[PDB]
Write a protein that binds this ligand. Sequence first.
Ligand SMILES: OC[C@H]1O[C@@H](OC[C@H]2O[C@@H](O)[C@H](O)[C@@H](O)[C@@H]2O)[C@H](O)[C@@H](O)[C@@H]1O
Ligand SMILES: OC[C@H]1O[C@@H](O)[C@H](O)[C@@H](O)[C@@H]1O
Length: 362
Amino acid sequence: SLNSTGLAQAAINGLNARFYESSNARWSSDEPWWISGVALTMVIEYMRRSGSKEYLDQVEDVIEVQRQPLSWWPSGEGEFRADATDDTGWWALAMVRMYDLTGNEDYLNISIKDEAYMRQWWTDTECGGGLYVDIQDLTYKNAIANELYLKLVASLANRAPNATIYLDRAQQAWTWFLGSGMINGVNLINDGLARDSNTGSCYNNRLPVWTYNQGVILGALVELYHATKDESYLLSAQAIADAVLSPSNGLTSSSGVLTETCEGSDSCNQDQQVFKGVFALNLAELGDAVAGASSDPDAGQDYREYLDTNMQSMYANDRSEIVPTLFDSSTGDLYDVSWSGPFRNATMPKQASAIGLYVANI
Ligand SMILES: OC[C@H]1O[C@@H](OC[C@H]2O[C@@H](O)[C@H](O)[C@@H](O)[C@@H]2O)[C@H](O)[C@@H](O)[C@@H]1O
Ligand SMILES: OC[C@H]1O[C@@H](O)[C@H](O)[C@@H](O)[C@@H]1O
């Protein structure tokens, strides 16, 4: 009897009431900029899946301000071209969703500029491929920047005029990712690559398995499927999702709730706080793709059931309602980091993650 649209809307209102800065057309300037990008993605997705337009004016306002040349990276010349390739990739994908919502070629063009900017930091001379995250420094090829890039080129393969150059890039980038060793022996993705001191060969650095690194890659494989109709892409995506769902890998609790590795120690930082909702949103994309690619009515049920199970735990154990006043009539819902542990405080990354989960159930 849960309304995921109603709850997503209350979570976005809570996000806006506590964290939106009208003077800055941004959420929480005291929180990383890339998470304003994620929040924009969540709000855009809400509107797409629910058919609402309630936050369109706000979303356009954020885009018009945040696409300006960044005060901390003016050489990027704005259009979300930032000092890290993953920061750029979050906003680029948000503009892909904006394009899907509106049909306005302006947003697609931004996505195209972002792809060309990110590709500047692809090299074949280290690790056989992939891009660096850290543009000034060029020391780390990690999972998330390369998953964002892959999902971006795969998305442009379905939407842009030179579709064939993008689909080549996407197939080459997926081949590189799969061969990098970052997907480990239980089909989960570790944080990035290390480089051998003597030989220059790269290997899985065995840093943690973060939920958003099991999630952006699913959206990328879903887009590769759509560009090629080759179900092998869904089969790979399903193996990664199936490993997240399996309690033996510890991302999923014995009560079946998605759990960041840092929750136990109560050490989830501003970044890690947003990871879960990113995985959720991408898992919903995979489920929709699997259910569509087949005639079996049970197709994608476990993904759908998983998302429901998480929604209901978050709803029940991790929610807090804003206190309306005689002056501020604002109403909505506030969320903490653990989708099962108790509510202690809300932050903007925790809130954006929460919206992602409700939007994945619309
Ligand atoms: O929290 C682990 C995470 O740390 C990453 O840096 C965090 C954060 O950096 C932003 O600038 C970027 O847009 C985010 O996607 C990223 O989470 C580190 O470099 C990652 O490899 C790692 O997963
Ligand atoms: O370098 C990363 C950038 O992150 C953003 O969240 C901040 O607004 C910038 O001041 C900072 O330079």
